[PDB]
Amino acid sequence: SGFRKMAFPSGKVEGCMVQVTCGTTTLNGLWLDDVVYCPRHVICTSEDMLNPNYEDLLIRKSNHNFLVQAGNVQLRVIGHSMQNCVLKLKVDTANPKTPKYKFVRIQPGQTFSVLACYNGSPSGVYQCAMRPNFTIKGSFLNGSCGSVGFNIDYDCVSFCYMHHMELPTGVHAGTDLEGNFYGPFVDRQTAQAAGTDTTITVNVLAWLYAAVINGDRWFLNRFTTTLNDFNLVAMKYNYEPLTQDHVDILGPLSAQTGIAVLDMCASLKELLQNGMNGRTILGSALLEDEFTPFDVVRQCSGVT
Amino acid sequence: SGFRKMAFPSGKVEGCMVQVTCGTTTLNGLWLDDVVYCPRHVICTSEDMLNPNYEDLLIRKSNHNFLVQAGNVQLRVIGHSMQNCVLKLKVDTANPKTPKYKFVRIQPGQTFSVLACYNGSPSGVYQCAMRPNFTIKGSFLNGSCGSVGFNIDYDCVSFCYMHHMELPTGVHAGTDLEGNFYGPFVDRQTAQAAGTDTTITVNVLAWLYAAVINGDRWFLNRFTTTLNDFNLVAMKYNYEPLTQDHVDILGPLSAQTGIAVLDMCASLKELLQNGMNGRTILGSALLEDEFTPFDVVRQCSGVT
Numbered sequence: 217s218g219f220r221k222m223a224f225p226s227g228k229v230e231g232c233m234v235q236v237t238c239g240t241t242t243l244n245g246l247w248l249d250d251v252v253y254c255p256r257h258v259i260c261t262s263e264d265m266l267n268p269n270y271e272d273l274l275i276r277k278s279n280h281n282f283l284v285q286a287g288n289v290q291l292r293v294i295g296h297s298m299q300n301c302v303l304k305l306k307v308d309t310a311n312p313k314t315p316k317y318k319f320v321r322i323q324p325g326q327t328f329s330v331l332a333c334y335n336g337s338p339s340g341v342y343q344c345a346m347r348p349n350f351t352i353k354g355s356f357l358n359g360s361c362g363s364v365g366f367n368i369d370y371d372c373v374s375f376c377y378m379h380h381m382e383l384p385t386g387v388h389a390g391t392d393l394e395g396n397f398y399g400p401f402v403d404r405q406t407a408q409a410a411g412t413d414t415t416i417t418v419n420v421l422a423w424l425y426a427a428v429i430n431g432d433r434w435f436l437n438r439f440t441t442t443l444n445d446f447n448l449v450a451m452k453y454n455y456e457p458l459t460q461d462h463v464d465i466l467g468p469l470s471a472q473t474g475i476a477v478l479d480m481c482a483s484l485k486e487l488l489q490n491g492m493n494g495r496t497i498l499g500s501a502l503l504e505d506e507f508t509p510f511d512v513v514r515q516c517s518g519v520t
Numbered sequence: 521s522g523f524r525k526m527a528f529p530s531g532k533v534e535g536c537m538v539q540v541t542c543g544t545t546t547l548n549g550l551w552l553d554d555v556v557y558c559p560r561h562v563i564c565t566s567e568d569m570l571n572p573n574y575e576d577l578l579i580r581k582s583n584h585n586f587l588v589q590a591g592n593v594q595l596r597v598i599g600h601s602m603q604n605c606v607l608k609l610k611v612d613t614a615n616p617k618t619p620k621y622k623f624v625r626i627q628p629g630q631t632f633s634v635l636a637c638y639n640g641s642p643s644g645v646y647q648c649a650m651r652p653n654f655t656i657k658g659s660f661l662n663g664s665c666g667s668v669g670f671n672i673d674y675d676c677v678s679f680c681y682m683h684h685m686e687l688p689t690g691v692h693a694g695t696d697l698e699g700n701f702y703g704p705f706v707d708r709q710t711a712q713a714a715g716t717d718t719t720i721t722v723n724v725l726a727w728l729y730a731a732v733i734n735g736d737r738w739f740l741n742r743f744t745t746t747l748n749d750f751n752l753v754a755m756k757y758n759y760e761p762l763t764q765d766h767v768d769i770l771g772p773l774s775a776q777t778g779i780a781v782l783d784m785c786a787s788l789k790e791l792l793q794n795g796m797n798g799r800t801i802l803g804s805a806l807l808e809d810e811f812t813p814f815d816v817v818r819q820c821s822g823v824t
């Protein structure tokens with residue numbers, strides 16, 4: 217029993233983190249096989265960041281201009297290329313600690329672990345979600361760029377995020393490991409505004425299921441609803457619309473608890489309309505939306 | 521910017537986790553040097569748990585009755601002893617991945633990371649606090665016993681907790697790595713009740729400082745208070761008394777933000793008396809007390 221915001225164990229990713237320096241700029245890189253992946257803005261002066269032409273700035277860079285350090289040992293860079301907003305640095309040594317891995321581009325509402333690093337050194341791990349506006353709410357100081365987001369399926373690390381920037385509002389934007397930004401963000405020091413940060417409805421429902429499983433039942437009501445009726449209320453409260461795909465995904469939690477998905481929807485509807493009235497659910501005074509249905513099943517079943 | 525509930529990177533502890541089996545009971549062990557540490561209740565049938573005499577149950581156990589598996593390789597047990605509520609199993613192989621380490625007994629209010637394991641395999645990491653009633657609110661299913669709590673100072677893992685049991689209320693109790701329970705709990709399947717789970721005041725104040733540093737300032741008020749006046753309000757709201765030691769500990773956050781500790785106390789006092797009025801602080805609708813002053817400094821300064 218008990219339900220915690222839980223990151224993946226980080227060791228497999230710790231063994232991939234390196235320091236990348238280009239001139240006076242130091243940030244983090246991800247060393248998989250004989251490639252180091254890092255934000256392309258590693259080549260920029262904070263002067264360059266105002267309006268960078270990456271292709272033009274890259275012409276002024278050779279292999280030897282990229283200093284890659286893994287622990288306190290320098291890696292030899294034998295190649296570099298720009299793919300979208302990341303640099304791939306070919307090094308002469310395959311990372312001996314390379315785990316089984318994939319690059320995945322996640323959808324909004326998907327959760328992942330972040331290993332926050334500075335100078336190629338891990339400082340902490342926490343659980344995030346890709347927000348519906350394609351931001352994440354992280355904890356990232358100067359030097360944390362190139363810190364990565366990941367999921368683990370048994371022994372395979374799926375890398376889904378690399379950190380590139382803070383928006384003026386203090387929320388975070390980054391790329392997949394092919395260097396494509398989540399959302400409409402660009403690696404330029406220009407005022408960029410996020411859209412509406414809506415609540416990830418399917419995740420709130422997963423977490424209400426988690427609460428019932430852990431004995432927090434006070435919010436269970438005598439009502440049901442329909443997807444259309446629920447969605448009218450969702451829209452009004454800046455919740456993402458619930459689809460039949462979301463209902464299907466919640467089916468195992470429905471089965472485990474014997475609470476029909478639409479019944480839990482009606483309970484959530486009353487929570488939106490009535491508020492918490494000073495009560496808590498799993499130690500939270502607000503509806504948590506950074507657990508996926510898969511996360512709730514995993515934590516409630518004890519997958520390793 | 522951004523402030524996250526952040527665990528220590530877990531790799532150093534992942535390399536210490538083993539499976540311990542005694543008969544039909546499997547749980548987790550911690551392999552440091554040539555010793556495996558695990559809950560002594562590994563020797564019990566759930567029948568034994570109702571009223572175990574550990575010394576008597578141990579007479580029926582030899583070295584070869586303790587099956588220790590590290591990955592999919594068996595370790596040879598060459599010795600066993602009971603220290604308080606843990607077993608120390610001497611094995612013939614020093615853990616090659618043993619990190620620099622200490623055993624520390626933490627005080628209530630101290631935070632630590634837990635690597636939740638099943639069958640000696642890490643499933644997740646999360647941040648806990650030792651509650652003032654010497655419980656923790658974890659996420660622990662059957663098979664998670666022997667999962668450990670830890671802090672990291674650069675390259676030295678301080679082990680502070682080993683998981684032993686759930687109370688009937690679904691909160692958690694365990695030992696330090698010398699096998700001494702936190703609080704008055706015993707490794708027996710008998711109804712045990714926790715005392716008052718009071719709020720860790722110094723930690724709430726640290727987290728309010730974290731909020732000011734991250735631009736969440738709406739709750740900053742025009743008042744100050746005294747320790748005695750604040751404490752009267754604290755007592756009434758089941759908050760731990762604030763000592764001058766707590767004020768000293770908050771001094772660096774006071775300095776960084778230019779908000780006198782007693783001023784932040786007066787802001788907290790008004791938050792207790794007035795509530796949040798539907799507002800959030802660092803994305804929370806309740807006052808977070810599972811960050812220490814040290815945690816706030818670490819995360820806000822980016823220590824690795």
Ligand SMILES: CC(=O)NCCc1c[nH]c2ccc(F)cc12
Pocket residue numbers: 257265380381382383384385402403404405406407408
């Ligand atoms: C807070 C703010 O001004 N954000 C605008 C984007 C921005 C500023 N500095 C950067 C450095 C690297 C990068 F890729 C993007 C940026």
Ligand SMILES: CC(=O)NCCc1c[nH]c2ccc(F)cc12
Pocket residue numbers: 561569684685686687688689706707708709710711712
């Ligand atoms: C929920 C509940 O009944 N808790 C009482 C203690 C208890 C039950 N099962 C156990 C197994 C091992 C152990 F060390 C303690 C216990």
